[PDB]
């Protein structure tokens, strides 16, 4: 069973990959944007759609992780080890939690075809000898 | 203000399915079958829909993301055990993991498998069905319970 | 490779697998079963069907491993490790054999159909804490 | 019961007796030949053919022999017999599965006649005297 | 024979040429680019193109060289040789991997077309002295 | 991403590793045999086919490493390495080179199946155990 989190939204893990890890905003960030302009929905009663199950979901898993993560400090003493965890979960985790929140998010936002599109876009012009590409990096509109 | 933390934030992985976290309750926490098998039952009848590039129903999607959190459970557990120097302490974290996270993980993949094998409706009907049974005091709860399956 | 005996069939080993060990009868007794009504188109030169083609195919490892164990009856000779083979035969390999004779002569006598959907509730069952589980287990029917 | 492993596919153990036993390639080749034409399918989840069930199965009984042979090796502790088994197992059976497994991908590989023909067509050269018995026996192919 | 890798392509080595060496990027995201995306078809049983094959035949030729590093790297000796070896492939042959994978991609994303008119355009420029070129260089776009 | 030289073409690495290493005849011959009956194609301003196109890639690639072959045996100055690279240059990365221009140049000239159908006709004979193997081992031709 090798489940892959974007192939039902036309993308893949490979792809998100294609941007820079440092690139994704905070989880923090995210969360705050999915409450900011969709809260509404996600705790609507409809599935609104996968992207919002998904996303749904998504933000519910990286809770749990929050949660494992207090416990933790909250049960363990060895700190040098309590915190090896209680980072692990904030930092290799949450990367991923990063970028599976910005997918949704931002398709819901710009429109998967867009977001896709972002995605190869970018992450081509990023890997572009500046002396020749577009000046400015590109940007997700409506 | 200042503002900020959890009570205050309604999202249910149940409600969009006309369930909620609060109604499983009926449910004795103690009576979901193993991650395992929950899991092994997934792939039964589900690995090549659930592989495919097609979201296939609220229940897959939802479904695949709770087969990986579980996952990255599974993997958080793993490197655990392989960077905390503290043993008792890596057997803490190990089992909080391994446990308890893991009921939850439980309870999805039940209700989504479920549904999917027996039908949203059906699958909560059990629940209320189970409900009363259960919640019938000993004196009177019968013989067999409530189940879902094939007559 | 990988190959899951069961796929062809629309089932899986995952499936098949909550069968718990008492459950399917004994290997003479599937056997027995099978000579007992499908002998003659298990004999016959017809494939008839990818079930039954299967099922000799398994009927006849099943012979090869009795062999292997009467061989080893007269050819083992520290009794102590010449029993220690001739049980796994009998016993883990045999329960192996087990499955794949009831999975297929059952299918035989009440369809992959029927016989899956079994296999579906039978799960569900037995996947029940006993707190839970009705006293009694479901049999398998032709409705 | 007498069930003939090849009747069903237009032959008969009778009839494969043509072949010398010392004729068969080795497991390995053969399951190497296997998966080199047939992984795919063979994993496929609908049975492609009768040949294909058959051997499907044949592949997967000498794989229980594997492991018949290999928890023999992990607990008989007197080697003598333990290595008694490990061959017998390693050695014997292994002769029909070699059969097996060689008369379903040939088939597979060239066509139940033409394999069937093959068969008639060897007996003759193995059977002609040594007088008059061709260089090069006959040999499947395409 | 005397093969110009391009010609197939509408394109001739000459052509090619103005593209200085900084301008294309890093073997490795060009290989990365490539993955990102074309990688399944690049992967899949579909010639999909003579731009496609080509593609393949070089993300290949290029790992050749990978090993003929990595071996020469654990097994030539005198490092200082050792290491003039592994540079020479680093460097020079991967520079030109690079084109390759650059003139190939590239089409594959905008099309001999646009690539081929980008490469007439840049050549202009590039071959501009400095007193007179204008300050930004040509950048390929899809139009 | 894994690329197989061979999947497109219908064949693969697996199937051509029927064929035994020490038979692709010599870059050479290859190369020789490939300016023989196709220089005028591969020079051609057209893809005359897949086959050629990778045939042209192939003859390219080769070259490479003759250059590289070359530059070390004129840039290293202790011999016993600079032979070292010289060698593994000129004989390990030759096979693949000589699997690559053999595979193409021959199907250019019998035919993808007839030239699949010989890779398959050869395992057998190859396979075939000593006893009962042909004098000759089967051959391509037109």
């Given at each position: 069973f090798h489940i892959d989190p974007y192939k039902e939204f036309g993308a893949t893990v490979e792809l998100l990959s294609f941007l820079p890890?440092?690139?994704?905003?905070?989880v923090r960030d995210l969360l705050d944007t999915a409450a900011a302009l969709y809260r509404d929905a996600l705790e609507s009663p409809e599935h609104c759609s996968p992207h919002h199950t998904a996303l749904r979901?998504?933000?519910?898993?990286?809770?749990?992780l929050?949660?494992?993560?207090?416990?933790?400090?909250t049960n363990l003493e060895d700190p040098a080890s309590r915190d090896l965890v209680v980072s692990y979960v904030n930092?290799?985790?949450?990367?991923?939690?990063?970028?599976?929140?910005?997918?949704h998010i931002s398709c819901l936002?710009?429109?998967r075809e867009t977001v896709l599109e972002y995605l190869v876009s970018f992450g081509v012009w990023i890997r572009t000898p500046p002396?020749?590409?577009p000046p400015n990096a590109p940007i997700l509109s409506t």
């Open positions: 890890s440092d690139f994704f905003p905070s979901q998504a933000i519910l898993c990286w809770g749990d929050m949660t494992l993560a207090t416990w933790v400090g930092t290799n985790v949450g990367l991923k939690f990063r970028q599976l929140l910005w997918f936002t710009f429109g002396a020749y590409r």
